[PDB]
Structure formats: C-alpha cells, structure tokens
Amino acid sequence: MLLPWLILIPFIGGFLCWQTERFGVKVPRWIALITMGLTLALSLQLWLQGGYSLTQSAGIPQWQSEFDMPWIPRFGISIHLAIDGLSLLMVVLTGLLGVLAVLCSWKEIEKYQGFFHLNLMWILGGVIGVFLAIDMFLFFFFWEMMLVPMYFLIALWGHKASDGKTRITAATKFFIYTQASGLVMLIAILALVFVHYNATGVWTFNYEELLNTPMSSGVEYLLMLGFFIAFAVKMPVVPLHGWLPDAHSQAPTAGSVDLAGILLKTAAYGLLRFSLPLFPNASAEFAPIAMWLGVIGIFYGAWMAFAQTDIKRLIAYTSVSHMGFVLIAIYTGSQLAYQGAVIQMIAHGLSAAGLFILCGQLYERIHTRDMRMMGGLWSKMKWLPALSLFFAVATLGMPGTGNFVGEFMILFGSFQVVPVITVISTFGLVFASVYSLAMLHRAYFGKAKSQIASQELPGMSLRELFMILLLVVLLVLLGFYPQPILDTSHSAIGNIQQWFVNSV
Amino acid sequence: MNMLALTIILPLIGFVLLAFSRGRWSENVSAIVGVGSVGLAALVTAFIGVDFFANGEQTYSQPLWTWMSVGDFNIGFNLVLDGLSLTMLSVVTGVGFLIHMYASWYMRGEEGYSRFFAYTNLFIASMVVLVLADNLLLMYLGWEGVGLCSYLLIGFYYTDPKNGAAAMKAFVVTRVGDVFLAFALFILYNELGTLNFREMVELAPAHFADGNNMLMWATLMLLGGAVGKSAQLPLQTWLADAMAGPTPVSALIHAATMVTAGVYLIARTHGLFLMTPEVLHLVGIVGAVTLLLAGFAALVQTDIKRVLAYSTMSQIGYMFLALGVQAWDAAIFHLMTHAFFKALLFLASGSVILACHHEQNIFKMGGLRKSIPLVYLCFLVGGAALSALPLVTAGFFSKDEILAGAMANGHINLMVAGLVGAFMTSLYTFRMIFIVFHGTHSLPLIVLLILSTFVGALIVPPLQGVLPQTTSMLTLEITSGVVAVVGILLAAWLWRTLVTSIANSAPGRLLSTWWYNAWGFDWLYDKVFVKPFLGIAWLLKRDPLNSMMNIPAVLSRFAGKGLLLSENGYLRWYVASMSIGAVVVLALLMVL
Numbered sequence A: 001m002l003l004p005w006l007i008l009i010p011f012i013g014g015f016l017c018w019q020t021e022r023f024g025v026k027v028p029r030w031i032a033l034i035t036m037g038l039t040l041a042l043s044l045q046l047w048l049q050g051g052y053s054l055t056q057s058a059g060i061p062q063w064q065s066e067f068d069m070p071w072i073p074r075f076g077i078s079i080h081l082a083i084d085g086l087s088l089l090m091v092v093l094t095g096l097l098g099v100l101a102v103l104c105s106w107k108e109i110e111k112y113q114g115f116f117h118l119n120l121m122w123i124l125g126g127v128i129g130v131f132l133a134i135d136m137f138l139f140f141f142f143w144e145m146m147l148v149p150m151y152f153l154i155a156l157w158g159h160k161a162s163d164g165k166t167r168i169t170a171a172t173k174f175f176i177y178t179q180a181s182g183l184v185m186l187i188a189i190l191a192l193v194f195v196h197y198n199a200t201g202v203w204t205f206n207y208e209e210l211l212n213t214p215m216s217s218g219v220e221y222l223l224m225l226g227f228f229i230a231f232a233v234k235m236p237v238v239p240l241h242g243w244l245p246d247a248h249s250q251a252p253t254a255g256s257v258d259l260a261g262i263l264l265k266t267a268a269y270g271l272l273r274f275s276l277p278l279f280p281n282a283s284a285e286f287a288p289i290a291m292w293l294g295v296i297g298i299f300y301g302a303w304m305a306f307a308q309t310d311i312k313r314l315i316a317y318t319s320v321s322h323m324g325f326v327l328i329a330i331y332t333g334s335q336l337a338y339q340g341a342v343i344q345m346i347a348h349g350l351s352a353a354g355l356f357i358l359c360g361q362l363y364e365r366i367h368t369r370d371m372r373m374m375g376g377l378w379s380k381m382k383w384l385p386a387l388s389l390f391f392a393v394a395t396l397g398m399p400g401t402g403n404f405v406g407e408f409m410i411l412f413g414s415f416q417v418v419p420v421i422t423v424i425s426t427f428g429l430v431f432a433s434v435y436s437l438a439m440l441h442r443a444y445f446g447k448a449k450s451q452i453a454s455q456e457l458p459g460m461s462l463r464e465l466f467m468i469l470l471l472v473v474l475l476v477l478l479g480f481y482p483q484p485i486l487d488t489s490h491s492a493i494g495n496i497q498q499w500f501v502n503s504v
Numbered sequence B: 001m002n003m004l005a006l007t008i009i010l011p012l013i014g015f016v017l018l019a020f021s022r023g024r025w026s027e028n029v030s031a032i033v034g035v036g037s038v039g040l041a042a043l044v045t046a047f048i049g050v051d052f053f054a055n056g057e058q059t060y061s062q063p064l065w066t067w068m069s070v071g072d073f074n075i076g077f078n079l080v081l082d083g084l085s086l087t088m089l090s091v092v093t094g095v096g097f098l099i100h101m102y103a104s105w106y107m108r109g110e111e112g113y114s115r116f117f118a119y120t121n122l123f124i125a126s127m128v129v130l131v132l133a134d135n136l137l138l139m140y141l142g143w144e145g146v147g148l149c150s151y152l153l154i155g156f157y158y159t160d161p162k163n164g165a166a167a168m169k170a171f172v173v174t175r176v177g178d179v180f181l182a183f184a185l186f187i188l189y190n191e192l193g194t195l196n197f198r199e200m201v202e203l204a205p206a207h208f209a210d211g212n213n214m215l216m217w218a219t220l221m222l223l224g225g226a227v228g229k230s231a232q233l234p235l236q237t238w239l240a241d242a243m244a245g246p247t248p249v250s251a252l253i254h255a256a257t258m259v260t261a262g263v264y265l266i267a268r269t270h271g272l273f274l275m276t277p278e279v280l281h282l283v284g285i286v287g288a289v290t291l292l293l294a295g296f297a298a299l300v301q302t303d304i305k306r307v308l309a310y311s312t313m314s315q316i317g318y319m320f321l322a323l324g325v326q327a328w329d330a331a332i333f334h335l336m337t338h339a340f341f342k343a344l345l346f347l348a349s350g351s352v353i354l355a356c357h358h359e360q361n362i363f364k365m366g367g368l369r370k371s372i373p374l375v376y377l378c379f380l381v382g383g384a385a386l387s388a389l390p391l392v393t394a395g396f397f398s399k400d401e402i403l404a405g406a407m408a409n410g411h412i413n414l415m416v417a418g419l420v421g422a423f424m425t426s427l428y429t430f431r432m433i434f435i436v437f438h439g440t441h442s443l444p445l446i447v448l449l450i451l452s453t454f455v456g457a458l459i460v461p462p463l464q465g466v467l468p469q470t471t472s473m474l475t476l477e478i479t480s481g482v483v484a485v486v487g488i489l490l491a492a493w494l495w496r497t498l499v500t501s502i503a504n505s506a507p508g509r510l511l512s513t514w515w516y517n518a519w520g521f522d523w524l525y526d527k528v529f530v531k532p533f534l535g536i537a538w539l540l541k542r543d544p545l546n547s548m549m550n551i552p553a554v555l556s557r558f559a560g561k562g563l564l565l566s567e568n569g570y571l572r573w574y575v576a577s578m579s580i581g582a583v584v585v586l587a588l589l590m591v592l
C-alpha cells in the first residue's frame, strides 16, 4: 500500500506548497524539494524491496503491487493501481526528474511561486498516476489531467523574452493536440468496454478483464488506431510533433517545465502496456507503418535539428529523432529491442534533461538563444561548454553513455527482426553525430560572432553543477553497467513480448 | 596478471584528472600527470610482455563484468592478450609515450595544455581498449572513443574555423566507417549468436556450412570500418584535409593509434576473413588502389604535412596489401616500423616548423643543411626508412617482407602495384627532402632515429600461434633495392628546369591539379553528400509537416469567419433563416 500514496504525496506536497506562500517566498522551494525527495525515496524503497531481478514472466497480468477501490461503481470504474518492473523504472525516472526540476527552479524569488510549484507537482503526480493506473478510465483521466497545469505554466510562466501571444499560442497548440488525441483514446476505451459488455455481459473498466475481448479485426484495428494516435501525439511521432519545439521554446526559461512534463515519455509506456497487450493482432498489422514513421521521425528530426538557430528547438528535434528510434523498437516484438527501448527511454530522459538544463543556464548567461550571436564560448565559460560537449556526445550515441546501450540494443533486436530499417536507422546515427557537432561548433567553437560572446561569462552555481554532474554520472553508469535496469524491466518486458507474440 | 585493466585505467585516470583540472595546474604538473600516466601504461605493458614471454606465449583472458545480458544476448566486459594484442599494445604505449614527451616539450606556452594532455590520454585509453577487447562491442567502444578523441585533437585550436571544419569532417567520415562496422556487428550477432572473436572463429565454419552470404557481408562491412579508420578507399579524404591540428596530434594519429586501428581490425578478424577469400583479396585491391592514389598525390603537394599525410596513406595501403596477400606478420612488422619512422618524421617536421616562422612554403626555402644539421639528419633517416634504403633501415626489411608475401601467394597485379608504389614513394620522399633541405639532441628524436635503422628491424613480433605464418628472395631484394636506388637517384637528379617544363605543360598542369585535389574525391563527396544535405536542410528549415498539420486551424478560422457573417443583427433575416430552416426540416422529413 504505497502506490495510492505514490500519487497522493506530490498532490499534497503541491497543495501545501501553495498553502505555505503566506510564510514567505523562499519557503515553498524547500517544501517542493521535500515532497519530491519523499516521492523519490519511496520509489527507491519500493525498488529495493521489490526483488525484480528474481521474478520470472508468469503471464499478463503480473504485478509487484496492486490496489483497487471502487470510484464510480455505476460504470464499474475504480481507482486500480499496479506496479511491476517497467512501471517502477518509469516512476523512479519521473521522481528523479521532478527532483531535478525543483532544484532547477531554485532562486525564483517572485510572487505566486507557490502556484508554480503547485502546477509542477500536479504535473509530476499526474505522470506518476498514468504510469501506475491499470483502470482504463482512470488511466485516461490521469493522461488528460496534466494538461491544465502544463497549459497554465507555459502560457503564464513561459519564456518571458518572447511576446505573451507567442506563449499563449504554443500552450493552446499543445493543449489542443494532446486533448484531442486523448478524446480519441477515450472513444477507443468506451468502444472496447462496450464490446466486452456485449460479447460477455460483464461491464467493467478493468484492464485485466478487457484483455480477453473477442472482436473482429477491423474493430481491433480502429481501437488500436485511437490508442496509437493518442500516444503518437505525445511520443512525438511525425507529423504530430509540431507542438513539441514551440512548447519547449515557450517553456519557462529556468528549464524545469521540460523536465517535469515532457522529458519522460508516457507514450512509449502506454504503447507497451496497452497497445500491444490489448490489441496484439492490430499492432502486428500496424508494425510496418509505425516503423517507417519512426525512420521518417529519425531523419526529419535530424534535418530539423541541423537547420535550427535556436538551441532549445535543436534539442527538441533531437528528442523527436530518438523517439523515432524507440518507436521502431516497440513494434519489433523482440525482447532485446524492448529492453533496448527501455534503456533508450531512460537515457533519453537523462541526456535531454542535461541538455535542457545546460541550455537554460547558457540563456541566463548570454540572454539569447540565437546560435549566430555566439561562438568561441569555450574560452568564456568554465564548466558549461565541456558539459554541453559531454551531453552532445551522449545524444550523439557514443559508447560509454547509456544512449549507446539503448540505441545499439534496439538496433541489434531490430536487425534480428527488420534489417533494412536498422540500416537506415544507423545512418540516422550518422545524422545525429552531424547535428551534435554542428551545435557544438556553432555555440562554443570558433570566434565570437557578437559582443555578448566576447566577454567572460559568470561561472556555474554549485547546485546546478552538481545535479548536472549527477546526470553525467548516471549516464556513464547506464552506459557501462546497465544490468540492474535490465534485470528490473526483464519480467515485464518478457510478459508483454510473450503476450504479443503468442497471440499472433 | 591483473594489469591489462591497469593499462586501460591509468590513461583514463590521467584524462579524468586533467579534464577536471581545467587548466588550473602548472604546465609541469599537467605534463607529469599525462606523460606519467602514458609512461606507466607503457611500463605495465613492458612487464606484461615480460610475463608473456616468461610463459609459452599463452593467450590470457581477464574478465571484469558482464556488459549486457538480455536472454541469449550476452556481451561481456573482458580483455584478452595474445601476440597481436601485445604487439599493438606495445607499439601504442611506446610511441604514445615518446609523442607525449615531445608534446610536453612542444606545447610550452600554449593554452589548453592540460586539455591537450587529457584528450591524448583518452585517445591512448580508447586505443588500448580497442586492441585488448575480446569481443566486437567492446572494440566498438574503443573505436568510437578513438574517433571522438581524434575529433577533439584535430580541432584543438578551436578559434580557427578551419581547424573545427577539419575535425568535423574527420569525425563524420569516421562515423560513416563505424556505421559500416556496426552493420558487421549486427550481422555477426544475428548469425553466430556471439561477438567474441575466438567464439566467432570457432562457430563460423559450423554455422556457415550451407550459405556463406552473411559472412561475406560481415567481412565486407568489417573492411568498411577498417578503411573508415585507416583512411583508405573510399573513406580517405579526412586524413588529407585534417592536418590543421598540432604536430604531436598528427604524430599520434599517423603512427601510434588512429590509422593502425583498421589494420588491427583486419588482423584480429583474420579467421573470419579467411573464410571469405574474395573479401580478403578486395582488402588487397583497396590497399593497392589507395597506395597508387596516395603515391601520385604525394608528389604534387606543396606542404610537408600533406606529403607526410599521403606517406601515411601509402604505408597503410602497404599494410592493407600485405593483409590481402596473407602476409600478416609482414603487415604487423610494417605497422611497427612505420609507426617508428613516421613518428620520427612528424617530430622532425614539428622541429623544423618551430625553427621557421608561421609555417611557410617549402619552395621558397632551402639550404637548411648548414643551419640545422640535426633536423636534417633525422629527416634524412626517416625518409630513408620511408623510401626503403637497403640494409640500413627497418622499412626496407618490412617492405621486403610485404613484397615476399606478394611473391609467395601468386598475385601479379598487387605485386606490380607494390613495386611501382615503392618507386613512387622513393621519388616523392627524396623530392620533398631535397627541395626543403637543399638549395638540441632531444631523447625521443634519438630513440626513433635508432629505431628507424636496422635496430628497429631486429625486433621480431611474437605473432607465432596467433596469426598464420606466411608461406627468388634474393632477386626480390635486389630488384627492390634497385627500384629504391633509382627512385633516389631520379629524385636527386630532377629537384630545376625540367620539372618546371613538365609542370607548366597543360597535360602536366592538369594532372598536377587533379592529383592535388585528392583525385577529385573531395569535390565528388561534396557534390554527392554535403551539398544535397545542406539543400535538404534549407528546404526543411521551416517545418513543412508542422504547417500541414496547422492547416486545420486555418480552415477552422476561415469557417468561423464565414459563419459569423450570418450574425448580421437583422431581425428580418433571423425570421427568414427560421423559415428557411423550417423549409429544410420539412423537406428532409418528407424525403425520409
């Protein structure tokens, strides 16, 4: 009995963060750090007591933890939480990212900072909730309720140098994309529930009972397509990626909203836990389309990243390319590629968190994000260009970082399944090296292209530097020793893979 | 022994300490840390070799952990040592230590001293990992690290945009080669189920009994990776265009680590290459072709660094030819001797650059045989080892062993390619030294001056039991010495009216300009890869997919603006619209 508290602790922490605004302005950051550390420590405790390295795949459903309480008993809707290895890896990841987001939004001495913390913990608790829910209506509810806090802290707390109309436009674009796709998912969920009620007589929203739903191929294809469109908006999958670079660029300039909301992909988890087990035949027929969309995402995100003059838009397009790799991995049906996708999700979260935090620090140092306005920043800053070099090397796919482990394990499994897509994706890795070196040469190398790049910039604060170094250490540990992560996710990955391949 | 992990860890410790130093230490302290870490690696390598020869040269394995274990996918973090690994490790550590000593002398009063030594220490660490890995994925780790360190070292003077452009070009070309190598790794795991070198060699004949297409694909992609790192065809432009970095960087890349990685990859995977004889002969053809183009391009260059770069290209082509004609011992021996004399030549070139000012042209300067006798003598003996002066230099013996391998295997085209390559090598080498030098006793200079003579030929690589033994010799020695001597005499005779008469002729000027442009491979690669990349990037700088997905918002705005015209505020129109809707409802109900 810790998953209900795993979702409740961020909510109560954000509520009391808003409540303690009367006691000061420097107060709610400490409460925010306390509640995020509490959530992270509880997730680490459930990891340490879980014993995921010694459990075998015994057939879906198989959870480490489970909880059920009737919420809307008229519809058979209940708060139904559960956890296994992959879900626990995701919740530990968002706990760590939320701690980093709180530590990144430090020294934001301003009025209504408590509401900013309240929105941040609503987003983080919502991400934890969609990672933990196994009731379909409850999962969709958690899926759609990050939207109001994210919209409000993009439109009201966003990039202050830009016009307020631009932030409002980006927030409305993000809201419309994600909420329309969520409504499509709700239609698919309702149709699945009604189909199970007609074919059996039992009315429920439980995921474990909706798995054995006899239906025609076209109906299953349509349900899978609704789920896939909902996940493809948030993955992002081209051409539904367009909300992401403007949402990143109009995010608050601290670089905490990116970590809190975007930089963990609940869409890959949603595909793995719902698109493959509920609709395995439809996913099997849909696999070539998703794989070619992933290839297009890889190369289009690479070309988009090379063309930017903004660093933040460049990093957003790198995220698009990496998620194209993950989308190829998910539909292979290969255990090796599934584990590589899990490693790639975690490594992408860490590396993109480091890139966005460094970009935010650079923007606070030089008051611009235009790459034509700088150059030669290696001789002006003490820590930022070398850490940026490390993180560009990491998202380049370099061995010694976890991105290489995830990417190449994806490519090994995919080459066992689909060789041509794997070949094209490895040339996508060449494209990744091209855009990473282009960003490094434009930002930190050469001569100064303006007057702000010709001065000795201020150094790095110790808290920012230490959490960047923590991300560096975690990425290096993932690259050199990914075995605890694989042993954690192996049982859930094997159960999903076996349910996917034994149903086709 | 538990000392191979020491040879990895010590340069890693040096890199980490000097990177986190960030230049706050003194020059002496940073030099002590970097050069001491590389020298400690060399001393541990020497003790490893002593222990290796103390036993019966037995192969030793040192596992550390399991890198990844997903089902049947078991990649281990293990090191292995045999004669080939010992030879490559000794060459890398010793030549890197000498280059580190010369760089500590050479980088005095330069910004980024500790950054330079951190990058070179990570380079040494990456190549030690490359030569000691027992499986292909750990070797790929070392491969990628070596490429990244070469990128960081070529663009060391980052303020000059040409240096960064050269470094970026080298990194992109080598990354293409490593993508070919990744294809080889994927094929070999998908077929054999393992990436361990000994296990792949043991499992290949049993698995590839019916079909042999996938093994040929894997060996072709291994050759693609090898020519990616060793700067051969068709991935060769980076070595020519990336000498903008410092001279010890060039010495390290050309002698110690970077270009010898492909030769090591071919030699280590010889068991897989022997099952695909067509791919091995293709290695030989690639080496011979790169030999010819490098030799022809080296004569028409007007810079010392570019001439030395194409010399490195030609000698790596010799090693690739030796691997193609199954002269593995000759290939590794030529690797060691070429490391010695090319490191010596780059050290002497750096000394003559420091003696001159601003790195001037070679044509306007001359008569340096009196001002600087020591650099002239070092350059002369390095060229003699490069141009194979008989019975006085180790390069003559190494090229003689390569040509004997070409003799014994019955290959004619590769034989004549090697012979005219030796001739062309003699002409361009003695051309360059007689153009520059006609008309302080540093310890590394003396060390690789001694090692460029027959004293370096006395060293025998312990490849017995690791690489297969190579299968008229007097006549071959006589004709090789004759070819080298007539090349020396011809280059002494010309280089100055006949050379101007030949060069100023329109076919002669056309050929000189064609061979100065790396046989047009830079232009060809630009027009087929770099210009269309920039064209597609410019075509896709405004996100067309985002605009096409934003089209429904435009449609919604247009439809709303059109619908708002009916709310004109006229009561009579409201009554008219009510009656129109009544007509529509009544007609629809009567139709159905």
Ligand SMILES: CCCCCCCCCCCCCCCCCC(=O)OC[C@H](COP(=O)(O)OCCN)OC(=O)CCCCCCCCCCCCCCCCC
Pocket (backbone or CB within 6 Å): A184, A187, A188, A191, A195, A198, A214, A215, A216, A219, A222, A223, A225, A226, A227, A229
């Ligand atoms: C624009 C944004 C919103 C998206 C579009 C709106 C939703 C569109 C849904 C279209 C559905 C088309 C159905 C066509 C046949 C209808 C009549 C029929 O014969 O139905 C068959 C079946 C009922 O027969 P029965 O045997 O009782 O069912 C047991 C099923 N084995 O029927 C059933 O069992 C129910 C079938 C339900 C099918 C899934 C509905 C949702 C699918 C996801 C959303 C639509 C597709 C993705 C989005 C498109 C682009 C925006």
Ligand SMILES: CCCCCCCCCCCCCCCCCC(=O)OC[C@H](COP(=O)(O)OCCN)OC(=O)CCCCCCCCCCCCCCCCC
Pocket (backbone or CB within 6 Å): A216, A217, A218, A219, A221, A222, A225, A228, A229, A232, A237, A238, A239, A240, A293, B552, B555, B556
């Ligand atoms: C102002 C802007 C808004 C207005 C303008 C824009 C358009 C809005 C409307 C868009 C949606 C249109 C309707 C889409 C659903 C169509 C449903 C349909 O025709 O179903 C027929 C059939 C039903 O299944 P059936 O075979 O009858 O099953 C019983 C026996 N098997 O179905 C099948 O058998 C399966 C059919 C699958 C293909 C049809 C759905 C295509 C969806 C395209 C979008 C998604 C593409 C994939 C993802 C791309 C990347 C995200």
Ligand SMILES: CCCCCCCCCCCCCCCCCC(=O)OC[C@H](COP(=O)(O)OCCN)OC(=O)CCCCCCCCCCCCCCCCC
Pocket (backbone or CB within 6 Å): A427, A430, A434, A437, A438, A439, A441, A442, B164, B165, B166, B168, B169, B170, B172, B173, B176, B234, B235, B525, B529, B530, B533, B534
């Ligand atoms: C065919 C068989 C043999 C195959 C192997 C051999 C052929 C391939 C060799 C490719 C070599 C390409 C070398 C390009 C180096 C470019 C370095 C550079 O500095 O480029 C300039 C630019 C730098 O970016 P920036 O920092 O913004 O600088 C300011 C802009 N001037 O950067 C750029 O403009 C970016 C340039 C991107 C180049 C991408 C190269 C991709 C290579 C793919 C090879 C695929 C082979 C198979 C092809 C299909 C066959 C069916």
Ligand SMILES: CCCCCCCCCCCCCCCCCC(=O)OC[C@H](COP(=O)(O)OCCN)OC(=O)CCCCCCCCCCCCCCCCC
Pocket (backbone or CB within 6 Å): A400, A476, A477, A480, A481, B005, B008, B009, B012, B013, B016, B063, B064, B065, B066, B129
């Ligand atoms: C190619 C590299 C060669 C190796 C040297 C450097 C490696 C990278 C160093 C940074 C990352 C370290 C992460 C991995 C540490 C070891 C993980 C591990 O599994 O240790 C346990 C192992 C004993 O247990 P094991 O053999 O795994 O048993 C099987 C389990 N049933 O424990 C052992 O066997 C002991 C292993 C000791 C390793 C010491 C490494 C010291 C490194 C110092 C410099 C660090 C530089 C960091 C940055 C590198 C570049 C990114």
Ligand SMILES: CCCCCCCCCCCCCCCCCC(=O)OC[C@H](COP(=O)(O)OCCN)OC(=O)CCCCCCCCCCCCCCCCC
Pocket (backbone or CB within 6 Å): A378, A379, A381, A382, A383, A386, A387, A389, A390, A393, A398, A399, A400, A401, A472, A473, A476, A477, B008, B012, B016, B018, B019, B020, B021, B022, B023, B112, B114, B115, B118, B122, B125, B126, B129, B141, B142, B144, B145, B146
């Ligand atoms: C296994 C053997 C090798 C095999 C191949 C391995 C390849 C993968 C290696 C991955 C690591 C990244 C490689 C490239 C990093 C480059 C960093 C760099 O440029 O460091 C130099 C720089 C100091 O240079 P300087 O210019 O003097 O200072 C700038 C301020 N004026 O330094 C600084 O400014 C400070 C340091 C910046 C970050 C240094 C690198 C961090 C990542 C590696 C160490 C991680 C932590 C060690 C422990 C790991 C866990 C055990």
